[PDB]
Coordinates of C-alpha atoms in Angstrom, one line a residue:
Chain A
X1 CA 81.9 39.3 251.2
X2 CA 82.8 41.9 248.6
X3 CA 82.8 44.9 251.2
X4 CA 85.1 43.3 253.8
X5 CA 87.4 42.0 250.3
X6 CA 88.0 45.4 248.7
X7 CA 88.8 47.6 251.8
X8 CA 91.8 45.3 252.5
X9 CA 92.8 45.2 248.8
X10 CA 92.9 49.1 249.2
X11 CA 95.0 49.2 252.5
X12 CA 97.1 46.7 250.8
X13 CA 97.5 49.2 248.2
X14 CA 98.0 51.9 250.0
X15 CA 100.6 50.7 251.9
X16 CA 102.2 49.6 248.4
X17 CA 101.7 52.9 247.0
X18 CA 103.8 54.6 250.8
X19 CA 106.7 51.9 250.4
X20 CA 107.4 52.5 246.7
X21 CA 106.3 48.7 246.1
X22 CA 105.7 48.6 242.2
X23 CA 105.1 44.5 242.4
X24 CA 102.7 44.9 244.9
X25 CA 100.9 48.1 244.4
X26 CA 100.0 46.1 240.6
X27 CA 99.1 42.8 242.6
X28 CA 96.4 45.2 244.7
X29 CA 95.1 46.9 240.9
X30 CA 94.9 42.7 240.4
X31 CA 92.9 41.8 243.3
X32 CA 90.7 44.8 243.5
X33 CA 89.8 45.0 239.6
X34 CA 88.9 40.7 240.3
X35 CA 86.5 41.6 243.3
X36 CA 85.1 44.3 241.6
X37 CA 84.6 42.4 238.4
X38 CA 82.7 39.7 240.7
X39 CA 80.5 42.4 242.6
X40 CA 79.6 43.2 239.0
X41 CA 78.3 39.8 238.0
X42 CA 76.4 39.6 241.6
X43 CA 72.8 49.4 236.5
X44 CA 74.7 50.1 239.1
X45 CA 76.3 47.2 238.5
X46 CA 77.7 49.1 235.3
X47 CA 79.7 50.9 238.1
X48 CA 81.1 47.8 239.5
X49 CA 82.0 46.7 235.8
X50 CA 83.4 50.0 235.1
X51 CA 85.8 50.0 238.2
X52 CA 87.0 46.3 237.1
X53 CA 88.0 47.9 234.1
X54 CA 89.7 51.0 235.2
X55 CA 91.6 49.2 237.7
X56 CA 92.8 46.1 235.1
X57 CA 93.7 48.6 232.8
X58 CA 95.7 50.4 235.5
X59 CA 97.5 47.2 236.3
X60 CA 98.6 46.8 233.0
X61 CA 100.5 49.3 232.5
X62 CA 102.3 49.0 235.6
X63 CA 103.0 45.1 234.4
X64 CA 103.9 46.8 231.3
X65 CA 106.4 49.0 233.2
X66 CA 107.7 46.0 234.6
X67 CA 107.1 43.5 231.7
X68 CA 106.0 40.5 232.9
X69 CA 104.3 39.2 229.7
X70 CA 102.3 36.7 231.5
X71 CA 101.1 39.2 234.0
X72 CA 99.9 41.3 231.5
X73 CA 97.9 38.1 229.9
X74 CA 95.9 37.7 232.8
X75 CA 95.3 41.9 232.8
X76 CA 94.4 41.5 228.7
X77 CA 92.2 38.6 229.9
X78 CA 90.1 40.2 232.4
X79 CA 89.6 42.8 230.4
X80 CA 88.5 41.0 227.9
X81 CA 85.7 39.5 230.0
X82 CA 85.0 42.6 231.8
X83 CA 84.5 44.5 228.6
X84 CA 82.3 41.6 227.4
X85 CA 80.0 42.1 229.9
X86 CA 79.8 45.7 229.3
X87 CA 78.4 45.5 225.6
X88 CA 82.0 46.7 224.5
X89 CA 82.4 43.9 222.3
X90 CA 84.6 46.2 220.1
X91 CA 87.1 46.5 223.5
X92 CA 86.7 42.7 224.0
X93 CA 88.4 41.5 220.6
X94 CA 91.0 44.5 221.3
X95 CA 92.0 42.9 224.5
X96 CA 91.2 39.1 224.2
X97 CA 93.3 39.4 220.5
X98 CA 96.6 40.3 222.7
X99 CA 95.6 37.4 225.0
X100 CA 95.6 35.0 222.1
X101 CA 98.8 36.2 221.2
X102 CA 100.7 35.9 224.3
X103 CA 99.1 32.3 224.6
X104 CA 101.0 31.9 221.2
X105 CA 103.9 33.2 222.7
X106 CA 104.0 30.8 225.7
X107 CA 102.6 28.1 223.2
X108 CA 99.9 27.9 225.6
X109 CA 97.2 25.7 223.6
X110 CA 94.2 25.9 226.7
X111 CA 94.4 29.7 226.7
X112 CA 95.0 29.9 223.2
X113 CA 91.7 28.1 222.8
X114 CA 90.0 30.0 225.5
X115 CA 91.0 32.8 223.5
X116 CA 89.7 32.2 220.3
X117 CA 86.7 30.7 222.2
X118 CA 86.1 33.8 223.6
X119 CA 86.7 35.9 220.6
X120 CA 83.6 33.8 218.7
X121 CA 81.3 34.8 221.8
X122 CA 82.0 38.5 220.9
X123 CA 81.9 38.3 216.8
X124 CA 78.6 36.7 218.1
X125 CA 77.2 39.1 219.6
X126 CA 78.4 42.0 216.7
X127 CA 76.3 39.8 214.4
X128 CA 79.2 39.0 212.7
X129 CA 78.8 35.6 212.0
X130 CA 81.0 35.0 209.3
X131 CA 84.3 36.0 211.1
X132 CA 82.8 34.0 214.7
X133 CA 82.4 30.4 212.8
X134 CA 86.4 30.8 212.0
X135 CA 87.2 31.5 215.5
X136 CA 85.0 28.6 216.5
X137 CA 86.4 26.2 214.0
X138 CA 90.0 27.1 215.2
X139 CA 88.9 26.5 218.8
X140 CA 87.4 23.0 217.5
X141 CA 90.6 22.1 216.0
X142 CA 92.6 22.9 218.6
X143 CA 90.4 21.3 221.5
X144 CA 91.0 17.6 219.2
X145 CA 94.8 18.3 219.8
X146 CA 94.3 19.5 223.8
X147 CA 92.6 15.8 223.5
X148 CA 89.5 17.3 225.3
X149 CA 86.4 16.0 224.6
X150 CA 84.2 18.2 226.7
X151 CA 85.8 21.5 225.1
X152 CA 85.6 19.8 221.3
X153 CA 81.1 19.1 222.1
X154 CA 81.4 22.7 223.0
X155 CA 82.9 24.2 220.5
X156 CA 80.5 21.9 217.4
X157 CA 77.7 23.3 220.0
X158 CA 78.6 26.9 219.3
X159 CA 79.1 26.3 215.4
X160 CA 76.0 25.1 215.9
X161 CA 74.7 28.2 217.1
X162 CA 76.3 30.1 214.7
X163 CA 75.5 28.2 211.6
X164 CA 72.2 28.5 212.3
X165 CA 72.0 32.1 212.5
X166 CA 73.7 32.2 209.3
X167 CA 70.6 30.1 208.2
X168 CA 72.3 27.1 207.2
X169 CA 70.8 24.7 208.9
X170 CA 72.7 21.6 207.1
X171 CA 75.8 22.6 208.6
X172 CA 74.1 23.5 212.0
X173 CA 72.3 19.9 212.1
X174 CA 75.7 18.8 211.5
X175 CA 78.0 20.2 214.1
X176 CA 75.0 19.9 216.9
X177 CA 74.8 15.9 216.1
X178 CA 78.8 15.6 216.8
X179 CA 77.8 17.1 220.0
X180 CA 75.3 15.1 221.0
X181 CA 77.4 12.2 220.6
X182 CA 80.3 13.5 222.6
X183 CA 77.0 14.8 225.3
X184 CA 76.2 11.0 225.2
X185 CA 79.7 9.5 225.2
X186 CA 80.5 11.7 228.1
X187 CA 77.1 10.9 229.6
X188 CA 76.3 15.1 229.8
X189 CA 72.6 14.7 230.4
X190 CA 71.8 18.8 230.9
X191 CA 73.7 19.1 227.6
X192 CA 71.9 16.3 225.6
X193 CA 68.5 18.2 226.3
X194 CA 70.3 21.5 225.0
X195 CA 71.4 19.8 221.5
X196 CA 67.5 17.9 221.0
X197 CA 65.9 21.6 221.5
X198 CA 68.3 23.1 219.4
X199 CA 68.3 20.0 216.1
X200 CA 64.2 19.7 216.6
X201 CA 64.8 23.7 216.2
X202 CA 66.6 23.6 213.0
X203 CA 64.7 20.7 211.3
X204 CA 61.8 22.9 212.1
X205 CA 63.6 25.3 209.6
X206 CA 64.1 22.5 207.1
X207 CA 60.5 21.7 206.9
X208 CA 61.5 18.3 208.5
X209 CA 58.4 17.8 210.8
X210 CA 59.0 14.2 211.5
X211 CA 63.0 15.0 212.4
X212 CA 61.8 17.6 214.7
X213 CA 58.8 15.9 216.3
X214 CA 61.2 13.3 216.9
X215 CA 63.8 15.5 218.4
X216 CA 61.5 17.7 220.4
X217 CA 60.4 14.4 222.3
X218 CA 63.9 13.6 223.6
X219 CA 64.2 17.0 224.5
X220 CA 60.9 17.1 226.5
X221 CA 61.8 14.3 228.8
X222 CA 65.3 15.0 229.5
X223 CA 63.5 19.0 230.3
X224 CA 60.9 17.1 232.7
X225 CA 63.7 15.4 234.5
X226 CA 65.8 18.0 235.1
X227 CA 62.7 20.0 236.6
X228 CA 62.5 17.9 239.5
X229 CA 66.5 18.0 240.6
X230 CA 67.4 19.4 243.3
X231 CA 71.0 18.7 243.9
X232 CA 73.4 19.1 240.7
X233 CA 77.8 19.0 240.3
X234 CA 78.8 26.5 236.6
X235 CA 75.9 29.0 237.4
X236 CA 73.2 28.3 234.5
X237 CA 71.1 31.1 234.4
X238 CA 69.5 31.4 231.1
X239 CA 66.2 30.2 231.8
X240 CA 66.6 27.5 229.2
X241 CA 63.5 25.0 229.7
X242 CA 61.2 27.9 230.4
X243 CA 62.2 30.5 227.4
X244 CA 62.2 27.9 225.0
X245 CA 58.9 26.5 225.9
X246 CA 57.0 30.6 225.6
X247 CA 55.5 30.3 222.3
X248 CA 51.6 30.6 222.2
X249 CA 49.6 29.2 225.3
X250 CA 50.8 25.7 224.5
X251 CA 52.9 26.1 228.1
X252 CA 52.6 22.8 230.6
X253 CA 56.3 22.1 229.7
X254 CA 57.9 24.7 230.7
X255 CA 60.6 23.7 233.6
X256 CA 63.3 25.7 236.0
X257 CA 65.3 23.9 238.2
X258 CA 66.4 25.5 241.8
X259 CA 69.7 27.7 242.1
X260 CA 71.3 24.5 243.5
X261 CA 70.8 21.8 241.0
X262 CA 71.2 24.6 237.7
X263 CA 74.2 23.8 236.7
X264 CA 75.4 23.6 233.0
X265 CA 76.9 20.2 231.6
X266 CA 80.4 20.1 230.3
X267 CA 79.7 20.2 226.7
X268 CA 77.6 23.2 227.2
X269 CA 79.2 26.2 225.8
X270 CA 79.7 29.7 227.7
X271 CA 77.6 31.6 225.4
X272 CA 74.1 29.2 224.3
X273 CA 72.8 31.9 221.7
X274 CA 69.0 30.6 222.0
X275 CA 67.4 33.3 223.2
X276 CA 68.8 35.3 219.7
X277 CA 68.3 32.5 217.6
X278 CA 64.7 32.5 219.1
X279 CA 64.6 36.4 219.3
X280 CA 65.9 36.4 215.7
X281 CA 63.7 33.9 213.7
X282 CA 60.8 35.7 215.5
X283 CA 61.6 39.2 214.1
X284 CA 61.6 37.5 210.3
X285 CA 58.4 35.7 210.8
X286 CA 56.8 38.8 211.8
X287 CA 58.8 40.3 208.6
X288 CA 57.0 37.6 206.2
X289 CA 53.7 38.7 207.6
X290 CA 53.0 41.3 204.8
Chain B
X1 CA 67.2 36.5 231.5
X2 CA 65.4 36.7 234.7
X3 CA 62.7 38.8 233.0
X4 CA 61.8 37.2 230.4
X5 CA 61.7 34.6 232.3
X6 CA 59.4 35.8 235.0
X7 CA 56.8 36.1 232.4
X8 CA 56.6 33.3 230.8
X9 CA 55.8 31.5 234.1
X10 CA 53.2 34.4 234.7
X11 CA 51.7 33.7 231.5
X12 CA 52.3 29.8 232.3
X13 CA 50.1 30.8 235.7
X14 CA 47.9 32.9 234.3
X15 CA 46.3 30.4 232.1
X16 CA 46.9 27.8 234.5
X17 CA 44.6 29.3 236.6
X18 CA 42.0 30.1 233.9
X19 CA 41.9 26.2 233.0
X20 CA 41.5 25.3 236.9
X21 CA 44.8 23.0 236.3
X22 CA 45.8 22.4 239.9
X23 CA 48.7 20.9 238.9
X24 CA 49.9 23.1 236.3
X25 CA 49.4 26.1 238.8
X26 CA 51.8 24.8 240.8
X27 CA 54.0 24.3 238.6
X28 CA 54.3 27.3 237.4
X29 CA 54.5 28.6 241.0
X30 CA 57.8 26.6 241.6
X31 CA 59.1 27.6 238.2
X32 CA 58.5 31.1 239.1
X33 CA 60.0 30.8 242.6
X34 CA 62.9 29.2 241.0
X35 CA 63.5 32.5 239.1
X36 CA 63.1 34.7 241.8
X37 CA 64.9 33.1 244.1
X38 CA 68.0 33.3 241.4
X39 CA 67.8 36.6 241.2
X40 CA 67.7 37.0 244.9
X41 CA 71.2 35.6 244.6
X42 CA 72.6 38.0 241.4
X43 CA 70.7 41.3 241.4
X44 CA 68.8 44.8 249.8
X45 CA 66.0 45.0 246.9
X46 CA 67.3 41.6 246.7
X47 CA 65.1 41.0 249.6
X48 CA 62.2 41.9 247.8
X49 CA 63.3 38.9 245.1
X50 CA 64.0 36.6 247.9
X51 CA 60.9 37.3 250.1
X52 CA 58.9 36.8 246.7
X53 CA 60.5 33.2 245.8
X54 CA 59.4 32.1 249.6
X55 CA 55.8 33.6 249.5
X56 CA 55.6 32.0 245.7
X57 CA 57.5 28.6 247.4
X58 CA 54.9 28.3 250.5
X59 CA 52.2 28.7 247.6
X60 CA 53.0 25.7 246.1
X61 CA 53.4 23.8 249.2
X62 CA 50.1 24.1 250.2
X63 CA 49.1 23.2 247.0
X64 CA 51.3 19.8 246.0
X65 CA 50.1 19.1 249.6
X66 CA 46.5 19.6 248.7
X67 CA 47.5 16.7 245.7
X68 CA 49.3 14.9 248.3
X69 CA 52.8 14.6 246.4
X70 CA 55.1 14.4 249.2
X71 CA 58.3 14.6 246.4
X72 CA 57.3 17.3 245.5
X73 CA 56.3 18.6 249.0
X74 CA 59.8 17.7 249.4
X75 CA 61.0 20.1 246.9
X76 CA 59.3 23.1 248.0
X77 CA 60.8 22.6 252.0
X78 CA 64.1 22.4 250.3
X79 CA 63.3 25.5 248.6
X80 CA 62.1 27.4 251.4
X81 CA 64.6 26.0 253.5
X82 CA 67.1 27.8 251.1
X83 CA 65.6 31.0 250.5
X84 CA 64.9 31.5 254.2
X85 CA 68.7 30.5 254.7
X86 CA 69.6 32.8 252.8
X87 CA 67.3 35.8 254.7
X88 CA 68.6 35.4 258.0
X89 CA 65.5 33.6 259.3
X90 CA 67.8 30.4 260.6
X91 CA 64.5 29.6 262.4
X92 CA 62.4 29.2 259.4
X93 CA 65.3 27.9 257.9
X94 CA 65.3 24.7 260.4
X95 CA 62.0 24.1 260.6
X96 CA 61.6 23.7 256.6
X97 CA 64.8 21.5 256.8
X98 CA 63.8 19.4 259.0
X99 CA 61.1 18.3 257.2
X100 CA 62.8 17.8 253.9
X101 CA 65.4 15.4 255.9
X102 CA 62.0 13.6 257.2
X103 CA 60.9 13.5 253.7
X104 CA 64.1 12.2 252.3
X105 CA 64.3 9.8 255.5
X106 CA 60.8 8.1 253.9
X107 CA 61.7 7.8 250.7
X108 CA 65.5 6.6 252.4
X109 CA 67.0 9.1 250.2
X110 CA 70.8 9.1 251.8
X111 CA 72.1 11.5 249.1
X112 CA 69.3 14.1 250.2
X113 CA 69.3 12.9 253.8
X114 CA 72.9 14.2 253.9
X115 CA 72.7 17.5 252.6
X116 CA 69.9 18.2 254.9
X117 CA 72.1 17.1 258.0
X118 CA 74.5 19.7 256.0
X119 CA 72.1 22.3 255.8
X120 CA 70.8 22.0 259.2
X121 CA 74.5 22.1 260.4
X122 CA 75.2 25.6 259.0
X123 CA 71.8 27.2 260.2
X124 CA 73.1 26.0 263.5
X125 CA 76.2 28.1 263.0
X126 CA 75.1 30.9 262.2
X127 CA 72.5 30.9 265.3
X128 CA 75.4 30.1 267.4
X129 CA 74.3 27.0 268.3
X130 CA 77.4 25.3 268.1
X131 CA 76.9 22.2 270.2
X132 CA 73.9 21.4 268.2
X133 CA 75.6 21.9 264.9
X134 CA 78.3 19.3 265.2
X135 CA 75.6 17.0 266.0
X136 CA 74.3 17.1 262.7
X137 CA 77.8 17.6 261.0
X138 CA 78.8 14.1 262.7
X139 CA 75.0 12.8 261.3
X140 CA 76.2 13.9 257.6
X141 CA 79.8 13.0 258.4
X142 CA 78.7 8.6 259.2
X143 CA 76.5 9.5 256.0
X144 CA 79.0 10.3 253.7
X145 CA 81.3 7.3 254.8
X146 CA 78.3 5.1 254.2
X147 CA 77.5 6.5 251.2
X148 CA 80.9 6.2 249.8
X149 CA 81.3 9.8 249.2
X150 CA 85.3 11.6 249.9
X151 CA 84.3 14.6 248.5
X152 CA 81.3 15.1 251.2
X153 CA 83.1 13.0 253.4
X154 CA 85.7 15.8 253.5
X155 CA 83.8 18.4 253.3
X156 CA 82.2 17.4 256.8
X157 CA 85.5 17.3 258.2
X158 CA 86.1 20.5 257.4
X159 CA 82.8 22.0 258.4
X160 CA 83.5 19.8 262.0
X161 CA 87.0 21.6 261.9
X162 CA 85.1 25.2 261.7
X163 CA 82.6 24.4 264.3
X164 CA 85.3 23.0 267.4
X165 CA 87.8 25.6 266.3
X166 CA 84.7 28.0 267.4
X167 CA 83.7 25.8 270.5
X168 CA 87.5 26.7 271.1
X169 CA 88.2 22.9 270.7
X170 CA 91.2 23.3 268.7
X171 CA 92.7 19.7 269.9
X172 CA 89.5 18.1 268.1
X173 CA 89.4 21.1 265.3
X174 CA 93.0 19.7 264.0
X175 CA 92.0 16.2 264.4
X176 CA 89.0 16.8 261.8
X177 CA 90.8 19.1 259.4
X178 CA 93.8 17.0 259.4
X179 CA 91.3 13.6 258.2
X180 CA 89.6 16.7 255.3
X181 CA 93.8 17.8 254.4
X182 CA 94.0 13.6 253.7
X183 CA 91.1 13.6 251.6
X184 CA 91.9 16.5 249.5
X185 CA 95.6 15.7 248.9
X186 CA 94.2 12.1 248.0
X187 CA 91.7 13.4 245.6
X188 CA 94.3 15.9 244.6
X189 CA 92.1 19.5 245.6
X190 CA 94.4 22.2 245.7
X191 CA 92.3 25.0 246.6
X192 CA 90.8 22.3 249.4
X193 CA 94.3 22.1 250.6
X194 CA 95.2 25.7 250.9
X195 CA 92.3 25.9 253.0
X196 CA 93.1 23.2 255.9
X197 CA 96.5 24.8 255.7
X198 CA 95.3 27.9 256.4
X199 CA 92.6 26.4 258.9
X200 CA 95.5 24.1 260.6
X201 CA 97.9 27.4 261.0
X202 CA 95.3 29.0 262.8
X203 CA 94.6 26.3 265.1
X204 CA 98.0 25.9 266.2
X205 CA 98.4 29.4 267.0
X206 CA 95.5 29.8 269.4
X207 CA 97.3 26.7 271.1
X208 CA 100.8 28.2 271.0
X209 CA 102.1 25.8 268.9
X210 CA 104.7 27.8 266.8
X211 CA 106.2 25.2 265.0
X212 CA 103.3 24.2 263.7
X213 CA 101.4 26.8 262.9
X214 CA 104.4 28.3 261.3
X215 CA 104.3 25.4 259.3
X216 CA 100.7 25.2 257.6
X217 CA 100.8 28.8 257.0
X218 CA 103.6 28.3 254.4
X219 CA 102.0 25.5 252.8
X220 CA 99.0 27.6 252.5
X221 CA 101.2 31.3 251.3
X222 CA 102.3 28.6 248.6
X223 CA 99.2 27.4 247.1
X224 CA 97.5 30.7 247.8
X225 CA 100.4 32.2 245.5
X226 CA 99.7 29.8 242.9
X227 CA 95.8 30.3 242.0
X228 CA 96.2 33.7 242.1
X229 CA 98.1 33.3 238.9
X230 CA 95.4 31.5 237.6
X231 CA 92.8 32.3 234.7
X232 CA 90.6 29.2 234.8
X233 CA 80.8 26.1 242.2
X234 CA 81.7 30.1 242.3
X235 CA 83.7 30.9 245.1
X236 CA 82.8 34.5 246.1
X237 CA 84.4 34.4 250.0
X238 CA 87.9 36.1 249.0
X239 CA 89.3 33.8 251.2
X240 CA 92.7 34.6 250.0
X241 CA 92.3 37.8 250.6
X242 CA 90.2 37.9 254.3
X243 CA 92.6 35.8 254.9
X244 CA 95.6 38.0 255.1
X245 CA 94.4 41.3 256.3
X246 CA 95.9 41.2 260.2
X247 CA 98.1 44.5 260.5
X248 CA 100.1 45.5 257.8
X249 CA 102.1 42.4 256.5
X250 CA 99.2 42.4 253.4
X251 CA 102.0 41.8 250.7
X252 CA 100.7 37.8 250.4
X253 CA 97.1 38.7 249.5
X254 CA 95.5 37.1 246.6
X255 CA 92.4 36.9 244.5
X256 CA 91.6 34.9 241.3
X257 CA 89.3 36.5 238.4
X258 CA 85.8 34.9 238.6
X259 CA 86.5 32.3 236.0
X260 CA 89.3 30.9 238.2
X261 CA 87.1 31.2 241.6
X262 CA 85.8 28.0 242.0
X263 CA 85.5 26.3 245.3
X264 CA 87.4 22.3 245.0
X265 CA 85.3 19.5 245.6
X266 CA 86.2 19.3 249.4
X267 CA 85.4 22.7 250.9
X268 CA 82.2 23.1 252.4
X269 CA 79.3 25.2 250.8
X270 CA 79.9 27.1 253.8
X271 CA 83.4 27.8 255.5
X272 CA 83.0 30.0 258.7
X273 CA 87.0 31.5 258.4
X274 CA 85.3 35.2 258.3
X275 CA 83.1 34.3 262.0
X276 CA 86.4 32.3 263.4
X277 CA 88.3 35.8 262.6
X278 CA 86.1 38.0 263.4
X279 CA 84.9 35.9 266.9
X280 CA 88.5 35.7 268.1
X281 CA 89.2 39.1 267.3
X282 CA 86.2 40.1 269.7
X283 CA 88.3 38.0 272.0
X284 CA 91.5 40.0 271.4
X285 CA 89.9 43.1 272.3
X286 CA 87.8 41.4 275.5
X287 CA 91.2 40.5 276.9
X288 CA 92.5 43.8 276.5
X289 CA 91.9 45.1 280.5

């Protein structure tokens, strides 16, 4: 519907723009940088993005003119997301780092979390790993205070992640385990599969074959399972059960459910940094190799 | 990650085929039309990813029918119903439906039963076939009760609500929308509500009930006002925006960022607002001379 959406944003802004409407003319820049943002996430698309961008950016300093602090947290926010899904990681922190700070300034502890949440996903992907596993701890604290369990298996799933980047897979193992309790306390079956792939991963790494076997098992029949859904309660579309399964010719198990029934579990983070993890311990076994 | 994706299942197929493992084959057929067909819906070459997930889909059909797995038959219909759905072929659509309801009617699969009624019900809709649309949103409406569902339950209100209000039933349209507005303020859906309000206020009007439709249209400017505001099923119909685009009084249009544009539990996978407008503005203009 993104056609039908964006010329009335304009004609709303238009007219904002004739009657010397300020409010409005920066709640059109709102609407019209959101549609665009979603036509971009539905390289061209890079135009979409871009237009998101301008037109956020434009909003804020109208909001900024007026200075509705809040309203420019939701501008710093999008932004932040928009720019994140760009490859301008170095814009993301920029904007997402005000956002935090306003969510301090409202004492807001959900966006304040979102925040740093969303600042880990971005020292993530600059490799910085160091600086993203204290984002990710702060978001893990605070998620213990919110009181929300779903947030808290996300946040030990992303340390997780990180740790094992880092290549310390003691402190991976760790954080993944308190997740797969919470994934079991909270019943998260998509999101148990994800932590028994990713422990049978690191073990791997240890040298622990019979850990791994073991944990490569649960993972293969909650995988098989999920294969045959068709109905399911969050877009997942990172090809989990098939990428993960794409080593050698040793193949049978990959899985892919329909659009419908792939959905991601609560305790499953934004980001799942698999495919680098994978992507990344493959470039260093081809680096032993001579 | 649809590309590496893609070749994974091609290599998963590839061998599949080499080792003459039927089974295998087809797995990786419905693997790979699981991929296509989400790309189809993310990234009009998009036909070419949609067409692909269907020709990939009827593959495997023929094939888990050759092994005689009527599961998994069942999964493939569903498929193709979907895909086709989502091509405009509302004929192929049906007749791949229908099938997966019969399917999910031997296995008494009431969960699946339902959302084959639903689906059937919006191919219907869109071929204009009202009449025989609310046959099958009343089917998947008893369901639902029976079933113990008030999220579905709702939801077939709703849809019920959509399809009179374009029979130009609005005395029965209300009556359904105003059970769905119970449901949602019972299980608390705010964006649900917004909706019937919305729904409701347009009713009204086409019956000349002023007070009334006055009424709803406030409750809905006041939620719509509030998640617009908002930062945190992806809702991609800009209702809230569609919404509010008659003439020049635009000034209560809003949109959420993507994050925040979810659907509630009680709006339909499809709402039909866009046909309603656009069907009684053809009417506007008809009357004209």
């Amino acid at each position: 519907n993104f056609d039908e959406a964006i010329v009335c944003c304009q004609r709303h802004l238009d007219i904002s723009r004739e009657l010397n409407d300020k409010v409005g003319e920066a709640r059109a820049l709102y609407n019209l940088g959101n549609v665009y943002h979603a036509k971009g996430k539905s390289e061209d698309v890079r135009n979409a993005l871009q237009a998101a961008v301008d037109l956020y950016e434009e909003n804020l300093s109208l909001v900024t003119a007026l200075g509705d602090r809040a309203a420019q947290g939701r501008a710093f926010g999008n932004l932040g997301n928009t720019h994140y899904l760009l490859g301008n990681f170095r814009d993301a922190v920029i904007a997402h780092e005000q956002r935090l700070l306003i969510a301090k300034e409202f004492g807001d502890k959900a966006a304040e979390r979102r925040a740093y949440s969303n600042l880990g996903n971005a020292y993530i992907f600059l490799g910085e790993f160091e600086t993203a596993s204290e984002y990710y701890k702060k978001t893990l604290l605070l998620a213990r205070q919110l009181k929300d369990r779903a947030v808290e298996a996300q946040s030990c799933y992303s340390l997780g992640n990180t740790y094992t980047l880092l290549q310390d897979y003691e402190k991976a193992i760790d954080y993944h385990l308190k997740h797969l309790a919470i994934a079991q306390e909270l019943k998260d079956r998509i999101g148990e599969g994800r932590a028994c792939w990713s422990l049978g991963n690191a073990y791997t790494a240890l040298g622990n074959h019979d850990q791994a076997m073991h944990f490569a098992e649960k993972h293969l029949e909650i995988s098989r399972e999920v294969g045959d859904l068709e109905v399911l309660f969050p877009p997942d579309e990172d090809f989990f059960d098939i990428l993960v399964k794409c080593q050698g010719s040793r193949l049978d198990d990959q899985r892919c459910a329909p659009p419908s029934a792939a959905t991601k579990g609560p305790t499953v983070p934004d980001e799942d940094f698999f495919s680098l993890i994978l992507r990344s311990q493959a470039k260093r076994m081809d680096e032993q190799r001579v």
